[PDB]
Amino acid sequence: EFNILMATDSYKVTHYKQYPPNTSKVYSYFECREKKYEETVFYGLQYILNKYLKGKVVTKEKIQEAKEVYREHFQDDVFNERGWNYILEKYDGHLPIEVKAVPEGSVIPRGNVLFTVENTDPECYWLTNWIETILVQSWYPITVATNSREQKKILAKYLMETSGNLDGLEYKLHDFGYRGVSSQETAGIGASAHLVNFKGTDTVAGIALIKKYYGTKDPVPGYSVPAAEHSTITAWGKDHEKDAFEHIVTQFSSVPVSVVSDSYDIYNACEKIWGEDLRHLIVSRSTEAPLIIRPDSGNPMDTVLKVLDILGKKFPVTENSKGYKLLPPYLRVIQGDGVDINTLQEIVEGMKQKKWSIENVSFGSGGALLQKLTRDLLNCSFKCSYVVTNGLGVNVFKDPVADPNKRSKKGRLSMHRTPAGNFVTLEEGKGDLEEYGHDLLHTVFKNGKVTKSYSFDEVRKNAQLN
Amino acid sequence: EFNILMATDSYKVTHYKQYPPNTSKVYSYFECREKKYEETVFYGLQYILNKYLKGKVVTKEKIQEAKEVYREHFQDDVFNERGWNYILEKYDGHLPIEVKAVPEGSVIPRGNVLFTVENTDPECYWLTNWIETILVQSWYPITVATNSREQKKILAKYLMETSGNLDGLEYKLHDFGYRGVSSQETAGIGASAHLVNFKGTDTVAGIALIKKYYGTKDPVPGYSVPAAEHSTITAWGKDHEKDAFEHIVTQFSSVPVSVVSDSYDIYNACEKIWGEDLRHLIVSRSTEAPLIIRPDSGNPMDTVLKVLDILGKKFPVTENSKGYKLLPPYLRVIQGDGVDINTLQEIVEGMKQKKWSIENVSFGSGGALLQKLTRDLLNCSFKCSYVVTNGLGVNVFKDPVADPNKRSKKGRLSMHRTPAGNFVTLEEGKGDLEEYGHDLLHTVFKNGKVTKSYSFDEVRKNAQLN
């Protein structure tokens, strides 16, 4: 079992002895601090609240375990056993805290309060920041969802430009990051964040997380298609790549099938094997079950353009209404190597210049999509901004002399829509002046209970492109 | 409950129908493929084997669940229900696979076989690569441990050079990555990997994982000390930073205490607050309970150097036997911002140039230590190199025309020590020629059972610096 009492940065175990005496309230907030990523998708807190913070998270056994663990870790007994016993006794192990947040899936400009946390019992003033570690990890789903959405924008722009519509956009970027992430839990969280924007993933763990913590009416929230890997092709022997291809497309003749074709010579595979030897098995396929050729090495853009050139010389090519070339409906390409937000842009731009519709190619991304992202990309930060000591409110904040960018907000915060339709975070409790509309944050957690939640369908709707 | 049948890349579910017919064996291997990081620490496989692959991992319930999930995911019933039921019925849910690996903690040059996987039942030829995804995630602890060890080398070099010994080397790089990683599980795995080289971490989960999956006779495998954060300092109010400091150092007067000092002005804090107003509370501390000043903003090197300059002007400084300046024993510094393998080198080099012993400063790293790393950093790859089809062995491999660096090894592999004391991976079963010593890989998993385990003490011993 997971023990929340051990799920915090070690030093926080000693903070209850560091706050000013007589502090009855500690109020903190999370934001994606201001500076390419002007707006962020707020997604993931609901997962964390439901999996780690709700219900009876404190037990006599967990308190004892934590006590022994930290005693050795610090080689001193500094663990706040009393404080946790109080929560166990008074609230049946339910956390005396209130969390307010903008709706899951919301697209909010940088520099705005996304969620706030405060203790609901004066005795638990120390709890607000104790749970910072667990809650700040929300940076990951937020960042994956945001970076994913930004790639969707790129694809939407070029697809619209070269085809005149956005049909199939939600299937243009597939999640191939399962093996490329740091753990099983991470694979699930990341895949679910990607699914906020797209439907393609090879990590079903993401689908399970979605149905368990969010819920969806969508019959197919996440999908994938049969696909070969280097092992299934190379296993046939180098001289029998053609036999591997033929066997695979024949086995999956009525469904779309992706076939990695760069095991030995991607260009020879496209021109001679697919384009000549087995061409008769491709042109006979249905628009519903195309062959998706998959290069997986070399310069991403150059390889895609050369593959398209080869395929265009071997298969009938049409020109859509926008004047861009389109491969026959039974043949497509997927580039799943070296694809990240930067190269994605380069590839579609190159395709556009060569007059190829973006309809022809879909993409896949792994580590770049779910692993090579940090809390610094969007400056995800959790900071205390208000406390009550001696019954007096105090607006707190940090403002490092050498880095003005790390200045944090002061006092009680609230977010509002402006008259022009934008967002603004009011500080120092100025939201009380009521010069703006209602605070956009809602209480989502209070005293061990999730008080407001969202289906994944609402999350996706909230995260839609404009 | 974790379901291994769902813990693989979606497309692998369709691979049992893609291998050449009459294939009774699929043999694959993991390596940190060649073309910094010339050697890797092999660590983490034991965790994965014990947590996810050992014992009865298949059940009627899990098979049915996977069956339903994949049906919706693929909108077709391609799931190999028959193959899994076979494992359930024949081996009581134990995986018919044999895994051989170099000892945990081993420091191996790039381009060598680190572990191999093969099915032990001809009917399970498809199982070898089914588990690639879960096993390949070993890239993370390997990479963290490797990058962490490379930072230890930098620290050892400069500590040795500026002080003449390696005293306290294992405490020079602290893991502050809990909030900066993608998940709770990742936090624990990463912290464990870091602990292969160092002892400091603020993620006790790493300690638990070590004791549960490796075991240690070490009384204190991982440690931390009391420390303040911006919230506990700023909560006192901007005009009372001194009161915060005074309160914290007195509360922790008998143990080492870290105090973040850049909330408003790191330089004013060091020179006027610590260096004057509260100097009397610092110079009175023991060598076992020093004040550890923590800057946390601005250029990492410039800030450390200016802080040292300031402290040197307010506190007694000695010159060690190597001619480097040393702060008094009751005063130290920790730079836990912007520290990565590259800036770490820059900081210690800058310190050495200014004649400050590395004994004066310790470091902390978060996302750079446990998050901003990818599978391609060491090119961690899993590939099929041998299969038996129609009773005949076939040496398998990939070799992309546009990228020779992606060429994989052929046939049965083994690793041996060379006469010069180096490492060599023999391919095509040449290890059988016996021109080299014994195979360095040992069977660690076979038919559902972990057959060879290493204590964390062995792991640490194996990963020590030369």
Side-chain angles (χ1 to χ4, degrees), chain A residues 1-34 37-466, chain B residues 2-465:
Chain A
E1 283 179 53
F2 179 85
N3 188 347
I4 190 67
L5 283 65
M6 303 176 315
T8 186
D9 289 292
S10 292
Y11 62 72
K12 287 176 174 295
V13 173
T14 70
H15 292 176
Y16 70 99
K17 308 169 65 175
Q18 296 181 35
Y19 289 105
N22 312 314
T23 295
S24 55
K25 186 74 162 181
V26 172
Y27 174 95
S28 301
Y29 79 99
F30 179 102
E31 71 170 314
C32 288
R33 207 169 57 247
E34 279 185 287
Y37 292 101
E38 291 182 291
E39 51 183 34
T40 67
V41 176
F42 182 68
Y43 166 72
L45 177 60
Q46 189 164 296
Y47 164 76
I48 299 170
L49 294 177
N50 278 286
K51 182 174 179 62
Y52 300 117
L53 300 175
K54 74 170 181 184
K56 185 174 179 64
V57 296
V58 188
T59 65
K60 282 172 287 300
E61 305 64 57
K62 286 180 178 181
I63 288 176
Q64 180 57 45
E65 173 172 57
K67 180 178 179 297
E68 308 181 310
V69 170
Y70 288 121
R71 179 168 57 200
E72 183 205 12
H73 192 56
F74 287 107
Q75 289 302 158
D76 190 359
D77 221 301
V78 60
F79 179 65
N80 188 11
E81 176 169 38
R82 266 199 55 182
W84 285 104
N85 269 153
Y86 174 77
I87 290 174
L88 180 57
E89 305 289 4
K90 189 72 175 64
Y91 302 103
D92 191 15
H94 285 56
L95 302 182
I97 64 173
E98 187 175 332
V99 181
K100 294 188 174 184
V102 300
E104 291 270 323
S106 293
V107 176
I108 310 299
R110 295 279 289 279
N112 287 111
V113 57
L114 299 183
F115 70 80
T116 59
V117 187
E118 61 193 304
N119 56 301
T120 60
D121 186 316
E123 291 299 305
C124 307
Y125 63 91
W126 55 270
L127 186 58
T128 299
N129 291 157
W130 170 291
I131 55 176
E132 154 176 26
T133 315
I134 184 71
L135 295 181
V136 171
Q137 291 194 326
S138 67
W139 76 264
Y140 182 59
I142 290 169
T143 302
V144 171
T146 300
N147 182 61
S148 179
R149 185 163 181 279
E150 285 304 308
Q151 292 173 87
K152 190 173 173 180
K153 287 181 177 176
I154 294 173
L155 286 164
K157 175 184 173 186
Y158 281 81
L159 185 54
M160 183 65 86
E161 166 68 300
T162 61
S163 73
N165 66 75
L166 301 178
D167 302 332
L169 175 57
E170 332 73 60
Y171 310 106
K172 305 297 289 182
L173 186 59
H174 208 276
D175 163 24
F176 289 152
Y178 207 164
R179 79 192 63 183
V181 292
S182 48
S183 69
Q184 286 296 312
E185 182 174 20
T186 289
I189 299 171
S192 76
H194 177 64
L195 286 170
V196 167
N197 311 112
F198 296 90
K199 285 185 159 60
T201 182
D202 285 325
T203 305
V204 294
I207 303 168
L209 184 163
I210 285 175
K211 291 181 178 181
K212 181 181 185 69
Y213 299 101
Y214 289 87
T216 182
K217 292 177 175 299
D218 178 23
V220 58
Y223 89 98
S224 184
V225 297
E229 61 176 35
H230 295 289
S231 78
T232 65
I233 297 305
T234 60
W236 294 69
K238 186 179 180 298
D239 299 314
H240 302 295
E241 176 173 39
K242 180 174 69 63
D243 299 322
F245 284 6
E246 173 166 46
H247 179 265
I248 298 176
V249 297
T250 300
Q251 289 294 294
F252 299 100
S253 64
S254 299
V255 297
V257 61
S258 169
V259 183
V260 63
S261 308
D262 75 328
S263 296
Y264 311 111
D265 189 324
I266 175 67
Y267 306 121
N268 166 259
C270 290
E271 185 172 293
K272 292 293 190 179
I273 306 183
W274 292 130
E276 291 177 37
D277 298 331
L278 308 183
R279 184 181 189 289
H280 63 288
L281 299 177
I282 306 310
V283 302
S284 60
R285 297 182 68 92
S286 167
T287 64
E288 287 60 56
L291 163 68
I292 304 170
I293 293 173
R294 181 187 153 216
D296 187 54
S297 57
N299 176 280
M301 183 185 81
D302 297 333
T303 312
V304 163
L305 295 174
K306 184 166 176 178
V307 162
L308 291 175
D309 177 31
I310 291 175
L311 295 180
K313 286 168 159 51
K314 288 300 179 175
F315 293 95
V317 175
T318 66
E319 177 179 297
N320 64 29
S321 62
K322 296 304 176 187
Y324 287 86
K325 298 187 299 302
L326 187 61
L327 289 171
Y330 53 70
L331 182 66
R332 290 288 186 267
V333 175
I334 182 170
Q335 172 58 183
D337 178 65
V339 174
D340 60 42
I341 191 173
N342 297 140
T343 60
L344 175 65
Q345 166 67 48
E346 303 184 310
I347 298 171
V348 298
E349 177 51 37
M351 290 178 63
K352 176 179 178 295
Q353 292 299 154
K354 289 299 188 299
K355 303 301 296 185
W356 284 101
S357 175
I358 277 51
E359 292 166 279
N360 300 112
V361 182
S362 287
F363 303 86
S365 189
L369 181 75
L370 308 180
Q371 183 58 42
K372 201 178 183 63
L373 298 172
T374 67
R375 199 162 63 86
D376 278 12
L377 186 58
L378 304 175
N379 295 321
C380 300
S381 183
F382 185 92
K383 293 294 172 296
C384 176
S385 66
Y386 182 77
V387 303
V388 176
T389 303
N390 291 151
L392 304 182
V394 183
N395 291 338
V396 311
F397 63 99
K398 56 176 292 189
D399 180 33
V401 65
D403 191 351
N405 296 308
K406 294 187 179 182
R407 177 177 64 66
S408 58
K409 300 180 189 303
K410 310 178 181 182
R412 287 183 296 105
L413 313 174
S414 52
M415 188 178 70
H416 307 75
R417 293 307 292 274
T418 63
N422 301 118
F423 303 79
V424 60
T425 289
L426 297 182
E427 295 175 50
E428 303 172 62
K430 294 182 185 302
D432 299 317
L433 293 182
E434 293 180 50
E435 311 187 316
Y436 288 79
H438 309 283
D439 180 10
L440 301 180
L441 279 65
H442 298 281
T443 294
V444 293
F445 185 97
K446 191 172 180 182
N447 302 323
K449 302 183 174 183
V450 168
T451 55
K452 198 181 194 303
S453 52
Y454 302 89
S455 69
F456 202 62
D457 302 310
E458 288 308 86
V459 170
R460 277 177 165 171
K461 187 172 188 178
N462 287 338
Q464 297 182 318
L465 299 187
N466 313 317
Chain B
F2 176 83
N3 183 348
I4 186 63
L5 278 60
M6 306 181 300
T8 186
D9 289 292
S10 294
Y11 72 156
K12 284 174 178 294
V13 168
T14 74
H15 292 173
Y16 70 104
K17 303 205 306 174
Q18 301 178 33
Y19 287 110
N22 301 298
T23 294
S24 55
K25 178 180 294 306
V26 170
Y27 172 98
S28 302
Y29 79 98
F30 180 97
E31 71 172 311
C32 288
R33 203 170 59 251
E34 276 183 289
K35 80 298 174 60
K36 76 200 304 70
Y37 300 124
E38 292 184 300
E39 54 185 27
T40 68
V41 174
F42 183 66
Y43 165 74
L45 178 56
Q46 185 166 300
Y47 163 78
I48 299 174
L49 298 179
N50 285 94
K51 182 174 177 58
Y52 300 121
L53 300 178
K54 77 172 179 184
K56 180 165 187 169
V57 303
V58 189
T59 65
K60 299 292 178 183
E61 290 65 53
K62 287 177 177 175
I63 293 180
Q64 183 56 39
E65 171 178 50
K67 178 178 183 171
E68 296 178 7
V69 173
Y70 287 123
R71 185 189 310 170
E72 179 194 72
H73 193 53
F74 290 110
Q75 288 298 75
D76 182 50
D77 209 297
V78 60
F79 181 64
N80 188 4
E81 172 179 37
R82 174 180 297 210
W84 282 105
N85 267 301
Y86 173 77
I87 295 171
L88 174 52
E89 309 278 290
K90 184 78 175 183
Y91 303 104
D92 187 43
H94 288 58
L95 304 179
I97 275 188
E98 167 164 43
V99 180
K100 293 187 179 179
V102 295
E104 293 270 320
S106 292
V107 176
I108 312 297
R110 292 280 287 283
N112 284 103
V113 56
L114 300 185
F115 70 78
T116 62
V117 183
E118 64 193 301
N119 53 300
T120 61
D121 184 310
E123 295 295 317
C124 302
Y125 63 89
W126 58 268
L127 182 59
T128 302
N129 276 49
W130 174 292
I131 54 175
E132 162 179 12
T133 309
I134 198 163
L135 291 174
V136 163
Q137 293 194 327
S138 66
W139 77 264
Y140 183 59
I142 287 169
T143 303
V144 170
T146 298
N147 182 61
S148 177
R149 186 169 180 275
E150 284 305 304
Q151 285 167 288
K152 189 175 173 184
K153 285 185 187 175
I154 295 175
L155 287 165
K157 180 178 186 302
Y158 283 77
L159 186 52
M160 182 65 80
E161 194 164 2
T162 64
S163 76
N165 66 72
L166 302 178
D167 291 34
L169 171 60
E170 59 268 56
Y171 307 101
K172 307 296 290 183
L173 183 57
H174 208 277
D175 160 32
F176 292 158
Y178 210 163
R179 74 190 65 181
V181 295
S182 48
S183 71
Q184 287 299 310
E185 178 170 29
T186 290
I189 298 170
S192 293
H194 177 62
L195 292 175
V196 167
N197 310 296
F198 298 91
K199 296 203 171 192
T201 180
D202 286 328
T203 302
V204 294
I207 309 300
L209 184 163
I210 289 176
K211 294 185 174 184
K212 176 173 178 54
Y213 295 101
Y214 289 87
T216 178
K217 295 182 176 178
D218 191 324
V220 197
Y223 92 100
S224 184
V225 301
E229 59 176 38
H230 294 287
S231 77
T232 65
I233 297 303
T234 58
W236 292 69
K238 178 179 171 55
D239 303 311
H240 303 292
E241 177 170 39
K242 186 177 74 59
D243 293 325
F245 286 9
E246 169 157 30
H247 181 271
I248 296 172
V249 297
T250 68
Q251 282 295 96
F252 298 100
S253 60
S254 297
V255 295
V257 65
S258 166
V259 184
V260 66
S261 308
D262 72 330
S263 296
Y264 309 110
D265 189 330
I266 176 62
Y267 306 120
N268 164 264
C270 291
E271 186 173 290
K272 302 308 173 189
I273 305 180
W274 295 129
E276 287 171 49
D277 305 336
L278 307 183
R279 184 180 187 287
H280 61 287
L281 299 180
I282 306 310
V283 301
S284 63
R285 303 177 65 88
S286 78
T287 302
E288 289 62 56
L291 162 68
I292 303 170
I293 298 180
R294 181 164 74 83
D296 192 57
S297 51
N299 180 281
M301 179 183 86
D302 298 328
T303 306
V304 165
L305 294 179
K306 187 167 178 181
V307 162
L308 288 176
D309 178 33
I310 292 176
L311 295 183
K313 285 172 164 57
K314 308 303 300 185
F315 293 91
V317 174
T318 62
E319 181 178 297
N320 63 27
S321 60
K322 286 299 185 295
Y324 287 85
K325 298 195 296 303
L326 186 61
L327 292 173
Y330 52 68
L331 180 66
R332 289 291 187 266
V333 174
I334 183 171
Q335 173 52 287
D337 181 66
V339 176
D340 62 46
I341 191 169
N342 297 310
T343 64
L344 174 62
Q345 165 67 208
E346 307 184 306
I347 300 172
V348 296
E349 173 60 17
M351 287 177 63
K352 176 193 174 188
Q353 284 305 307
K354 286 295 180 177
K355 292 297 180 180
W356 286 99
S357 173
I358 275 57
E359 291 162 276
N360 295 299
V361 183
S362 283
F363 302 85
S365 188
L369 185 73
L370 309 180
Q371 185 58 41
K372 194 169 181 55
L373 299 171
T374 64
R375 189 172 62 85
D376 61 293
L377 183 56
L378 305 173
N379 292 141
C380 301
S381 181
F382 187 89
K383 292 293 176 298
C384 174
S385 67
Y386 180 74
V387 302
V388 174
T389 300
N390 285 148
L392 297 175
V394 179
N395 296 328
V396 182
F397 69 97
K398 58 178 297 189
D399 182 35
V401 67
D403 191 356
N405 290 311
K406 284 186 174 182
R407 182 176 191 173
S408 59
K409 301 179 188 298
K410 310 188 299 179
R412 290 186 299 104
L413 315 170
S414 51
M415 183 179 77
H416 310 72
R417 299 312 292 278
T418 61
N422 297 129
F423 292 94
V424 64
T425 291
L426 299 179
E427 299 170 49
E428 311 178 315
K430 293 183 180 180
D432 288 356
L433 293 178
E434 306 145 302
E435 307 188 306
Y436 288 84
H438 296 298
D439 187 356
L440 304 185
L441 276 66
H442 302 298
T443 293
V444 297
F445 184 95
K446 187 171 184 178
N447 301 324
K449 299 175 172 58
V450 168
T451 56
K452 173 64 174 180
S453 298
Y454 296 91
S455 68
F456 201 66
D457 303 307
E458 288 178 291
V459 172
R460 282 181 159 166
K461 180 59 178 177
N462 290 335
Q464 63 167 49
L465 298 186

